[PDB]
Symmetry: none
Subunit: 331 residues, 4 copies
């Protein structure tokens, strides 16, 4: 039996659910040979009501070099980056839910990802299998990938289908915890674009640049646009696509018209659909946002680490696209 000393960065909805999940499942962890010992939880305001015991909270950065593991679910990019890098340079692994971080600081983070120090299942579709789904898909070669990767924009579209306005639906999405007070990253497709980047790096190109993704959000959509789609036997969804074009991989996020019985259109939750050679057509669905769903992913990654398995590796080298085969209707 050994102690697993954990530094948690972020005590929001994600960080709180992960804290409580770790302790609630400490009986599982002992089967893996450890007892969880949180060193501290970096938070913005330590005197705010929060579902973590108050004495464990830290308003200021603390030394991570004594941790066995860093778990991060902070907002943003540069501050978490600067906090995690000294831990990663010391060979301490990182489990993170921070898709922005990984999408936007990859020049700094790739060498540690290549060494198996970064676990980030929770950074795409929360605790729904997504990174692991693509790790198994690596048996095949990708022909086309389409996902519905953001929870907020799925929620808003579903509600606008029912005749709720954008604003009404957004307010609801904010109360359910899918969206922040400023939902810009969600509703402009940028969160889908960060997640799409990460999918690309795992499966097809370990250098894929976030800046190459072409992203458009849901701003042109209204209940009318959606009802008319429905009349045409279609549903409109914000889709994240990865496909070959003129010999290179291209990534796009945009509203797309789907057949109404397509797996993407029907899905229970966020979804990832792929067509690959020789496997064929495969699909995964589940919750893509929320504290408990995200914490599940972080905890799956902690078990992965405890079992002796390395983190999520980028593709070992860029793969060649097979189909230039390049799909679509936009709205």
């Amino acid at each position: 039996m050994e102690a697993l000393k954990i530094a948690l960065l972020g005590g929001g909805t994600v960080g709180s659910a992960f804290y409580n999940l770790v302790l609630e499942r400490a009986e599982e962890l002992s089967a893996f040979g450890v007892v969880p010992r949180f060193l501290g939880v970096l938070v913005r305001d330590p005197r705010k009501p929060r579902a973590i015991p108050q004495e464990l909270l830290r308003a200021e950065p603390f030394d991570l070099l004594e941790a066995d593991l860093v778990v991060e679910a902070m907002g943003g990019v540069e501050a978490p980056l600067r906090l995690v890098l000294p831990a990663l340079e010391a060979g301490i692994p990182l489990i993170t839910a921070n898709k922005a971080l990984l999408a936007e600081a990859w020049e700094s983070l790739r060498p540690f990802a290549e060494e198996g120090l970064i676990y980030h299942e929770a950074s795409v579709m929360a605790g729904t299998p997504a990174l692991s789904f693509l790790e198994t898909l690596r048996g095949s070669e990708l022909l086309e990938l389409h996902g519905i990767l953001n929870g907020t924009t799925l929620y808003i579209l579903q509600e606008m289908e029912k005749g709720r306005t954008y604003a009404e639906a957004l307010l609801e999405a904010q109360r359910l915890g899918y969206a922040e007070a400023d939902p810009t990253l969600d509703v402009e497709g940028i969160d889908a674009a960060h997640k799409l980047t990460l999918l690309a790096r795992l499966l097809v190109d370990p250098g894929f640049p976030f800046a190459e993704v072409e992203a458009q959000g849901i701003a042109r959509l209204t209940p009318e646009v959606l009802q008319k789609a429905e009349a045409r036997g279609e549903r409109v969804r914000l889709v994240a696509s990865l496909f070959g074009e003129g010999g290179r991989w291209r990534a796009a996020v945009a509203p797309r018209r789907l057949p109404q019985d397509h797996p993407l259109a029907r899905a229970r939750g966020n979804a990832l659909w792929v067509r690959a050679r020789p496997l064929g057509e495969a699909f995964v669905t589940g919750p893509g946002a929320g504290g408990g769903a995200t914490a599940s992913g972080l905890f799956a990654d902690l078990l992965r680490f405890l079992s002796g398995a390395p983190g999520h590796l980028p593709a070992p080298r860029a793969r060649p696209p097979l189909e230039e085969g390049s799909p679509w209707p936009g709205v």
Copy 2:
């Protein structure tokens, strides 16, 4: 005495500061023959402790068309846009602090700005005069404009000079209320870009596109870079610049090496510096973030309206730069 009927969108840090500031100032408002009456306050979570009466809280959108004013202090672009448009279409003015809305939804909002229906002093440098400052600078032709527009990135650089790390300073900037939980828009220069666009539109080109601003944040900066600048007699700041290059106006946001005695380097707060002909060199400084600071600007605009003055107009035409210019050196 008559009611001045206000619909308020947003009951957070700004919207609550504004609401309580309006109540404080009810005696001042009676000097225009009005009493402030709120039709409703749009908020996300009606359960949260809030210095606004529970009975005025609205968790869902409410009809705006009886208002005399809509005041908006929500986050993001599209939802505020869709909420305000029917009021603007009805000829109801909008008072807003939402620099992103204005920068990014200008195709929709420009016509109403042209009719005097949009008041937005608080969208740049909060209640520090910035838009009014340029309104007065219209008396000259612009040579160049350089501003330190974002509160969070000023604060973080100020702290890093003193030896603090980025993350320490950020966290404090967040506790102070300059930066949100996700401060990406601040620290990547995007907030300064949004503000820069609005200054360009007021002064020199009423169609100036947000997408044309070149923006880069503070992510390459550290206490050691700032300390080496200091030993060279410089200060590094994130600067928003508007200047002529090749006969076209160029807008950029980037870290710049300033002479340490420059007004911009010595700024008490956020700052806007402007050389124009024939005036010369003028400068304004003051707080550029914060609940009260922002509410001061919103309320300045309410008084502007009540006094009979229209909102902030775009430049009446675009025109080319009078002279070729250049910002300070960037950071190597």
Copy 3:
């Protein structure tokens, strides 16, 4: 028109309701010739969610000597005392809801009360008239005073009559905001004793010592004890009494058996009953706890001050009891 600069001490339920009430009624205050300007609000944790704008909060003591008025609704005795004394010595008035303070620090506070610098209607029966009720009763001489002065213990007794247990009722009282997490002062009769002391000082003896009050709380009471009272045509209430005995004033708090149709037994809320010569029998009832009820009292006192009227003065000299006349059944 002038500015009224206010320092508020305490931003709890009382301090928050008083802040918001002052601004909501600023149109009234302008009729009194002022505009309210809060200097700052002393709070324990300034980053806690609170119904006061965050920038006005102060985690540390601030200079009061620039205020026109101090309003205090802090817990406890010695800290508020030390905070208010320099303001009182500078001739700045105090409006307070803090019955403990006044009951327990009267050696320090009496000289300022005698000068009309302390307003404390809200310290007894919240914004229900109580101090003002006794100021008018001063036309007569007191024969006997009986009050039901604590909200929590009234609430618990009322609920236990209906068959709710003590603990159940207390938990409820805590959610309604009558009682704190540790309700000891309420349920031991000590809060009634502080309030009774203050009533005594106003009407009968400006030196009345808090330490002379004989207090017993509600610990012997159960739903059974109460149901049996009801069977005897009685109600049991915790009563605060002031009466003459052997030539002196005596004050007691204790459970007492009341006739069920007595005004004290029926009262809508907390209550004060008096029999005085020559007026006769008079009575006042209303809410005795809660943020809005307390804020009402503080604001009544602010209007009192703004109108030019002094604070609540102690009796000018101890009065002689007329009846030694000394009542009771205990339980």
Copy 4:
């Protein structure tokens, strides 16, 4: 493996620390062949953010009689008393931190303490050994006992020495979690009195009455009184004393002038100092407030129970003091 069924009363700072500490230590508990299972957690407000699962929260009292243990960390006396009595009557042990309950409801609780059913290490100096410390000191006859028992009043004096005012220090003591919103019980010496009573009952008189302790708080103290003590080579502390006078044990709480080199004056935390015959002079120090510190004591008691040991017993008889003693000088 079997369930150790726990009913927890209180989900605040202590009860939440305790709950999470138990979950942390589930591996340690398996070494006794048990897994911790909570029947319910009694809390005031089930809506508040809390590190305990929502489904275990109980806003109303719940049946305790299936528990193997009741752990209590509520405030006040009567309501906890009425909640725990039926469990004690059923032979279910109580683990508690509630010094007021024990001090003030002893007529009801003494019989159960005599049967080994009450564990209360955390009721004095939190998880710092205090009750176990006296259990071992039973090997001698008590000469005198002097303790610095309250965390808030130690903290405030420590700060006032350094020049802080009372109110500044208090507010920080409250933010640190030593003192509640109303800190009257701490600062008036009543909490130290409650603790002193319990030490007396364990050591010298199982019926010792709380009402016989003479208590006086820190209200006469200021930075200037403490600074004058320091210039005389002294430190002023609030001390809880048990000592013989006139053949009877006397219990007092008051400010005392200590020699600055005395163990009590130099205490790292709250402290308990004891001269006894034939042992000599013994001393224990450690944190005497705080969520984690308190939970450590509660959990120590859980382990004591699980290991087969009974709770803290009162002294088996009363007896008179062996010698006539005296505390330090009070503060002039």
